[PDB]
């Protein structure tokens, strides 16, 4: 992914690391359904 | 960062290319050249439109204001799409009846969009059955065909 160091600031949002993990989990499911 | 480049006497092509390349980062230029507004405009570039009323509704103002704003759902004659139009004036909603025809135009907010404490409404009613709504609100005239 591309870097947005502004997203790492914690004021008014959750941690960027776990958002990235959640997005990567979401993208796996779409890829699996595409192969079917 | 060093001096701005290119500055050479015979470097016109690169300079023109650079200026053209970074002009696409301007959002106003991009929307005009690619004609993005015309692709999604329900009014199809017109300043006014004519439609038929389907029902009456009311919308709550945003915080920290309080109140109900009277609006109508309008189906456009030219393409059949359905939009929402605000009815300006004190008690103006009483002059609107279902299945009437109305003329609508932009409401006049920033960037050609909504205004005030009612986002989501982009239009306002101007005429009802070919009679000015402002007159009806003030008086001076009666709504035709009862």
């Amino acid at each position: 992914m591309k870097r947005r160091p502004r997203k790492w600031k914690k004021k008014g949002r959750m941690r960027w690391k776990w958002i990235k993990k959640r997005i990567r989990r979401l993208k796996r499911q779409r890829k699996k359904e595409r192969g079917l | 960062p060093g001096k701005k480049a290119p500055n050479g006497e015979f470097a016109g092509r690169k300079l023109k290319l650079k200026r053209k390349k970074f002009r696409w980062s301007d959002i106003r230029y991009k929307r005009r050249v690619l004609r993005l507004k015309e692709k999604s405009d329900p009014l199809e570039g017109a300043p006014q439109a004519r439609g038929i009323v389907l029902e009456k509704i009311a919308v709550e103002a945003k915080q920290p204001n309080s109140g109900m704003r009277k609006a109508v759902r309008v189906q456009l004659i030219k393409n059949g799409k359905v939009v929402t139009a605000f009815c300006p004036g004190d008690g103006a909603i009483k002059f609107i009846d279902e299945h009437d025809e109305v003329i609508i135009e932009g409401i006049g907010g920033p960037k050609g969009g909504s205004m005030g404490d009612i986002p989501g409404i982009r239009y306002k009613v101007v005429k009802v059955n070919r009679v000015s709504l402002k007159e009806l609100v003030k008086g001076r005239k009666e709504k035709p065909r009862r």
Binding site: - | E55, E60, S66, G67, M68
Partner: protein, 92 residues
């Protein structure tokens, strides 16, 4: 003291869905997802299991409505003495 008129009827609050939305069982057998008008939303607190006046919406008068008036315990007893509300309706 006020009484339902036209489409208005008696209802019992069943559940609070939040965001100024309530669930109300009417006196005919229809559960309606009702909205609390702002005029009376800023003055009277309402809890689960109270008698209110339900006015159906002019469009889709089968699942949506509004709450226009709430009665008090003394008014509930007065209506019970008059004979307009019954124990079965209160208990559902």
């Amino acid at each position: 003291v006020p009484l339902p008129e036209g489409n208005q009827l008696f209802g019992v609050v069943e559940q609070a869905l939040g965001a100024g939305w309530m669930d109300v069982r009417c006196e005919d057998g229809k559960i309606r997802r009702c909205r609390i008008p702002g005029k009376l939303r800023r003055r009277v607190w309402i809890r689960v299991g109270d008698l209110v006046i339900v006015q159906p919406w002019p469009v889709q008068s089968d699942k949506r409505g509004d709450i226009v008036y709430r009665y008090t315990q003394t008014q509930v007893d007065w209506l019970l003495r008059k004979g307009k509300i019954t124990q079965e309706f209160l208990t559902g």
